[PDB]
RNA sequence: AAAACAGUGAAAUUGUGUGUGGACCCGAAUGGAUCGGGCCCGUCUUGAAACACGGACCAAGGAGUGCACAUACACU
């Protein structure tokens, strides 16, 4: 629902506000923040967060996100990049489509699934998996590497 | 601290921290409009903006 | 059109209600006659079963 | 669908027009209410108490051993103020609990797609008589809905302007507004909200005309452009079906603005006019159709009586008789 | 005023003599003036009324609720509706078998005359008929 | 004799509609549709109708959506399929068999594809016209367990546990799965 | 520090008059003596009528709120 009354409004008239008579509601009975984790809170850490207290891995003091950013597509989705009206033309037509993945912000092609239509296609990208290359060549298509 | 959560990390410890509200947003927009308009009269036939290259 | 078809249902159901009611009373009347004869039988067979033991 | 008649200054009608596609769309009173609630909160101004009120004085606790409660007390001499109870929320002149503060979130978001849909079905409701009457607009004397005034209205004076509105049948509606003025109940009458009036007709124009400044001084008349028509004006208080006077140009523009059913509007990019989960509220009546009546099964009306255990009533259901046999 | 609903005329006295006159006063409202008579449920750890010892008073609850048919019925055998306009009586025109009207306190003398004239011709019972308009 | 009679009764009562449940939506078009099905249930024993009526009462999360290809995969050779939910497009598929879908809603891109390949979409008010004796229908269902948030349920510090920790994440930062099996 | 209208004028508390009782509450009654049942509330506590603590009386004020970040549920 888009709106509902709160619990606090029902607790008017009931002594302890739902915190108990014996236990009460004190200020900080367990400590502040995420502290105590090697000591009295060891059971919470070993159950939910086992890889917290450690150092790991190779270090580079400065990294650049733009130099490493990439996005991946599978062969089964190649025909899907085209508009539905465009798909329905190339399905019947005698011509071969020329699809450039760079134009949709994809740089690497993966070998997942089968091609939607079993007719030739030209695919342009920066990198192909070994499975992807074999699948495209199977239908008489061509893989073109480009920057 | 109890139950399962992503471990906290909220940075509100510093007592000297300032807050910035944006109640002035519609009014400052109206001032920028009125400055451009009057600037456009001072040089009437000429465009307010210069030509720039493509890189 | 459906507002007219709603009337045909109401009529059809009243006929069916009166019909089933009449069929019920006949069963109830039939059952009462079987029950009279049967009770006379069983009260006599108890009497027979008792004499078998005395013998 | 239908044609609609245009009305000239003198009350004659001659030219006629088709009706825009938006008016065939079903109405969702849930979504109109939700959208009203959120948008109404975007016009608020912030309020707060002063940032350290109640905390001015030099105060300290006396501690135990003095036969007094350990509240902070005011350090002073020579005045009756000495020894009184200072800073806490339970003290006279102390600081309030959780002081109100400027950082509260004043506005509210609503998806653009819901805002567009809510305005479309608000426009639709302006042409169903049941809704218009339901809001409390009185339309007994009006010939037909919707009203479309012609162009070539050459009016410039309020004198002639009212004569036009009277000829469209609006007299009783306008009177209902003038007689309504009253002073508000409660403290709002001190805070610049003194007088309250009932809502009346909204006039919608699109092209600049002299008629706008001829009608505006008449109580309860309200004006807006079609291209920036707001839900606060179309569904006041979150109830739909306000009475609208269209201008002929504005009525034709509704086709460019909302488009046609199962198409995309050119004026509102990414928006299309959709389908409900069922076409009408009357679908419960499909039960009586031939196709359903073949499917189902014949009911049993005969039902069992409730259990009875009283001595005398039970004895008429089960007459007991003794036996002598010992088997 | 001595009037009765005709559908209940031979039953109304049984109904009236059957209504409870029990009161549920707040615990210890008899002991200190700062505690009003209005019911509040006791929530103490030791409290004798909450723990239902014999000799303490009774507490409210669902068992005491009246039968659905008798409930809300005034001692003349009608249910009541509030009115403040001539246009309000117009609503009762279908319901006058079981409902009667009670003019709101703030309606003044000049207006009350107009309400009563309409009530006479429509055949609606008004229970505040005398009201302020006795003079 | 009696033990069978008892069990066969329990199995039946487990299928039938409860009649003390109601959908929480304030949508009057949705509440209309429920009223129809409710009045059909009290005049029939047919299991498909009872299943449909129970599903209209479940939450938005319980009514999880399906993609076009998965409907065909589960249709198991039937002509008509029924689904209390929304049908979405599959970008991986172009050609499909001819099929009739009765369902609650469909996306714009899915409806076009369905139509180009031949086939129809009908809303659930029309079921009784599409089919005479409900013998040629399949009923289909999604599964809320496939939500990406189910990867975090449980404890990652149990032995053999497949669950993922809730963690900060970056190029170097992030807690791993360490107690699973591979 | 206090202190608004020469408005309205509650409760605690006092005097006079008229009635009913001897701390008072619940159940049931008489023309009339009364009959039966009930220890002082709130609170910590295995356990309070306690020789455990707080409470002379009345009015007014008086305590789970706002923001940021992840989250499960309901609704669009």
PDB file of C-alpha atoms in Angstrom, chain D residues 197-319:
ATOM      1  CA  UNK D 197     -14.609  29.857  -2.547  1.00  0.00           C
ATOM      2  CA  UNK D 198     -16.020  26.905  -4.514  1.00  0.00           C
ATOM      3  CA  UNK D 199     -14.384  25.816  -7.781  1.00  0.00           C
ATOM      4  CA  UNK D 200     -15.995  26.689 -11.126  1.00  0.00           C
ATOM      5  CA  UNK D 201     -15.215  26.388 -14.895  1.00  0.00           C
ATOM      6  CA  UNK D 202     -11.699  26.159 -16.373  1.00  0.00           C
ATOM      7  CA  UNK D 203     -11.060  27.825 -19.776  1.00  0.00           C
ATOM      8  CA  UNK D 204      -8.346  26.327 -22.036  1.00  0.00           C
ATOM      9  CA  UNK D 205      -6.963  28.266 -25.003  1.00  0.00           C
ATOM     10  CA  UNK D 206      -3.566  27.488 -26.761  1.00  0.00           C
ATOM     11  CA  UNK D 207      -3.639  30.700 -28.927  1.00  0.00           C
ATOM     12  CA  UNK D 208      -3.472  34.254 -27.518  1.00  0.00           C
ATOM     13  CA  UNK D 209      -6.877  36.040 -27.586  1.00  0.00           C
ATOM     14  CA  UNK D 210      -8.657  39.029 -26.010  1.00  0.00           C
ATOM     15  CA  UNK D 211     -11.316  36.762 -24.472  1.00  0.00           C
ATOM     16  CA  UNK D 212      -8.838  35.746 -21.751  1.00  0.00           C
ATOM     17  CA  UNK D 213      -8.780  39.189 -20.132  1.00  0.00           C
ATOM     18  CA  UNK D 214     -12.539  39.665 -20.681  1.00  0.00           C
ATOM     19  CA  UNK D 215     -13.624  36.676 -18.563  1.00  0.00           C
ATOM     20  CA  UNK D 216     -10.984  36.602 -15.829  1.00  0.00           C
ATOM     21  CA  UNK D 217     -12.590  38.929 -13.249  1.00  0.00           C
ATOM     22  CA  UNK D 218     -15.722  36.712 -13.041  1.00  0.00           C
ATOM     23  CA  UNK D 219     -15.569  34.705  -9.722  1.00  0.00           C
ATOM     24  CA  UNK D 220     -14.611  31.045 -10.062  1.00  0.00           C
ATOM     25  CA  UNK D 221     -13.375  31.239 -13.667  1.00  0.00           C
ATOM     26  CA  UNK D 222      -9.855  29.819 -14.072  1.00  0.00           C
ATOM     27  CA  UNK D 223      -7.489  29.713 -17.135  1.00  0.00           C
ATOM     28  CA  UNK D 224      -4.611  27.510 -18.435  1.00  0.00           C
ATOM     29  CA  UNK D 225      -2.882  26.591 -21.734  1.00  0.00           C
ATOM     30  CA  UNK D 226      -3.406  23.132 -23.186  1.00  0.00           C
ATOM     31  CA  UNK D 227       0.317  22.423 -23.543  1.00  0.00           C
ATOM     32  CA  UNK D 228       1.026  22.811 -19.803  1.00  0.00           C
ATOM     33  CA  UNK D 229      -2.262  21.629 -18.254  1.00  0.00           C
ATOM     34  CA  UNK D 230      -1.715  20.550 -14.610  1.00  0.00           C
ATOM     35  CA  UNK D 231      -3.333  17.809 -12.474  1.00  0.00           C
ATOM     36  CA  UNK D 232      -3.982  20.312  -9.642  1.00  0.00           C
ATOM     37  CA  UNK D 233      -6.310  22.162 -12.055  1.00  0.00           C
ATOM     38  CA  UNK D 234      -7.791  19.001 -13.654  1.00  0.00           C
ATOM     39  CA  UNK D 235      -8.525  17.055 -10.460  1.00  0.00           C
ATOM     40  CA  UNK D 236      -8.920  19.524  -7.496  1.00  0.00           C
ATOM     41  CA  UNK D 237      -8.644  17.799  -4.106  1.00  0.00           C
ATOM     42  CA  UNK D 238      -7.845  14.538  -5.956  1.00  0.00           C
ATOM     43  CA  UNK D 239     -11.394  14.016  -7.345  1.00  0.00           C
ATOM     44  CA  UNK D 240     -11.780  14.036 -11.122  1.00  0.00           C
ATOM     45  CA  UNK D 241     -14.189  15.583 -13.616  1.00  0.00           C
ATOM     46  CA  UNK D 242     -13.799  19.371 -13.727  1.00  0.00           C
ATOM     47  CA  UNK D 243     -16.008  21.259 -16.189  1.00  0.00           C
ATOM     48  CA  UNK D 244     -13.975  22.680 -19.121  1.00  0.00           C
ATOM     49  CA  UNK D 245     -14.640  25.317 -21.808  1.00  0.00           C
ATOM     50  CA  UNK D 246     -12.462  24.413 -24.820  1.00  0.00           C
ATOM     51  CA  UNK D 247     -11.293  26.819 -27.512  1.00  0.00           C
ATOM     52  CA  UNK D 248     -11.571  25.365 -31.047  1.00  0.00           C
ATOM     53  CA  UNK D 249      -7.786  25.395 -31.653  1.00  0.00           C
ATOM     54  CA  UNK D 250      -7.113  23.725 -28.282  1.00  0.00           C
ATOM     55  CA  UNK D 251      -9.561  20.868 -28.904  1.00  0.00           C
ATOM     56  CA  UNK D 252      -7.860  19.952 -32.200  1.00  0.00           C
ATOM     57  CA  UNK D 253      -4.456  19.961 -30.494  1.00  0.00           C
ATOM     58  CA  UNK D 254      -5.321  17.013 -28.216  1.00  0.00           C
ATOM     59  CA  UNK D 255      -4.601  14.674 -31.162  1.00  0.00           C
ATOM     60  CA  UNK D 256      -0.988  15.881 -31.477  1.00  0.00           C
ATOM     61  CA  UNK D 257      -0.470  15.830 -27.682  1.00  0.00           C
ATOM     62  CA  UNK D 258      -1.820  12.379 -26.754  1.00  0.00           C
ATOM     63  CA  UNK D 259      -1.768  10.759 -30.198  1.00  0.00           C
ATOM     64  CA  UNK D 260      -3.948   7.800 -31.193  1.00  0.00           C
ATOM     65  CA  UNK D 261      -4.621   4.434 -29.568  1.00  0.00           C
ATOM     66  CA  UNK D 262      -1.665   2.012 -29.828  1.00  0.00           C
ATOM     67  CA  UNK D 263       0.556   4.673 -31.437  1.00  0.00           C
ATOM     68  CA  UNK D 264       3.356   6.891 -30.115  1.00  0.00           C
ATOM     69  CA  UNK D 265       2.790  10.610 -29.452  1.00  0.00           C
ATOM     70  CA  UNK D 266       5.129  12.910 -31.373  1.00  0.00           C
ATOM     71  CA  UNK D 267       4.776  15.674 -28.759  1.00  0.00           C
ATOM     72  CA  UNK D 268       5.425  13.397 -25.732  1.00  0.00           C
ATOM     73  CA  UNK D 269       8.465  11.252 -26.650  1.00  0.00           C
ATOM     74  CA  UNK D 270       8.414   7.655 -25.389  1.00  0.00           C
ATOM     75  CA  UNK D 271       4.701   7.678 -24.468  1.00  0.00           C
ATOM     76  CA  UNK D 272       1.834   5.581 -25.828  1.00  0.00           C
ATOM     77  CA  UNK D 273      -1.751   5.050 -24.762  1.00  0.00           C
ATOM     78  CA  UNK D 274      -2.342   1.665 -23.204  1.00  0.00           C
ATOM     79  CA  UNK D 275      -4.747  -1.168 -22.323  1.00  0.00           C
ATOM     80  CA  UNK D 276      -6.231  -2.197 -18.961  1.00  0.00           C
ATOM     81  CA  UNK D 277      -6.386  -5.805 -17.668  1.00  0.00           C
ATOM     82  CA  UNK D 278     -10.119  -5.831 -18.480  1.00  0.00           C
ATOM     83  CA  UNK D 279     -12.111  -3.574 -20.803  1.00  0.00           C
ATOM     84  CA  UNK D 280     -15.014  -2.646 -18.457  1.00  0.00           C
ATOM     85  CA  UNK D 281     -16.251  -2.800 -14.848  1.00  0.00           C
ATOM     86  CA  UNK D 282     -19.233  -4.932 -15.936  1.00  0.00           C
ATOM     87  CA  UNK D 283     -17.308  -8.164 -16.648  1.00  0.00           C
ATOM     88  CA  UNK D 284     -19.040  -9.962 -13.750  1.00  0.00           C
ATOM     89  CA  UNK D 285     -22.055 -10.165 -16.084  1.00  0.00           C
ATOM     90  CA  UNK D 286     -20.207 -12.594 -18.390  1.00  0.00           C
ATOM     91  CA  UNK D 287     -21.422 -15.355 -16.038  1.00  0.00           C
ATOM     92  CA  UNK D 288     -24.834 -15.238 -17.696  1.00  0.00           C
ATOM     93  CA  UNK D 289     -23.412 -15.864 -21.192  1.00  0.00           C
ATOM     94  CA  UNK D 290     -24.279 -19.023 -23.118  1.00  0.00           C
ATOM     95  CA  UNK D 291     -20.650 -20.230 -23.155  1.00  0.00           C
ATOM     96  CA  UNK D 292     -20.440 -20.166 -19.336  1.00  0.00           C
ATOM     97  CA  UNK D 293     -23.835 -21.728 -18.703  1.00  0.00           C
ATOM     98  CA  UNK D 294     -22.835 -24.835 -20.683  1.00  0.00           C
ATOM     99  CA  UNK D 295     -19.648 -25.211 -18.633  1.00  0.00           C
ATOM    100  CA  UNK D 296     -20.947 -25.232 -15.044  1.00  0.00           C
ATOM    101  CA  UNK D 297     -23.124 -27.689 -13.052  1.00  0.00           C
ATOM    102  CA  UNK D 298     -26.700 -27.743 -11.669  1.00  0.00           C
ATOM    103  CA  UNK D 299     -26.945 -26.514  -8.040  1.00  0.00           C
ATOM    104  CA  UNK D 300     -28.439 -28.292  -5.045  1.00  0.00           C
ATOM    105  CA  UNK D 301     -30.821 -26.050  -3.100  1.00  0.00           C
ATOM    106  CA  UNK D 302     -31.870 -28.618  -0.457  1.00  0.00           C
ATOM    107  CA  UNK D 303     -29.961 -28.058   2.789  1.00  0.00           C
ATOM    108  CA  UNK D 304     -29.756 -29.848   6.170  1.00  0.00           C
ATOM    109  CA  UNK D 305     -31.279 -28.496   9.399  1.00  0.00           C
ATOM    110  CA  UNK D 306     -29.205 -27.486  12.446  1.00  0.00           C
ATOM    111  CA  UNK D 307     -28.661 -30.022  15.246  1.00  0.00           C
ATOM    112  CA  UNK D 308     -31.161 -30.031  18.157  1.00  0.00           C
ATOM    113  CA  UNK D 309     -30.660 -31.874  21.468  1.00  0.00           C
ATOM    114  CA  UNK D 310     -33.479 -30.659  23.776  1.00  0.00           C
ATOM    115  CA  UNK D 311     -35.455 -33.495  25.434  1.00  0.00           C
ATOM    116  CA  UNK D 312     -38.872 -32.876  23.885  1.00  0.00           C
ATOM    117  CA  UNK D 313     -37.762 -31.839  20.418  1.00  0.00           C
ATOM    118  CA  UNK D 314     -35.416 -34.829  20.238  1.00  0.00           C
ATOM    119  CA  UNK D 315     -38.177 -37.266  21.251  1.00  0.00           C
ATOM    120  CA  UNK D 316     -40.208 -36.320  18.150  1.00  0.00           C
ATOM    121  CA  UNK D 317     -37.176 -37.087  15.917  1.00  0.00           C
ATOM    122  CA  UNK D 318     -36.294 -40.378  17.706  1.00  0.00           C
ATOM    123  CA  UNK D 319     -39.170 -42.071  19.553  1.00  0.00           C
TER     124      UNK D 319
END
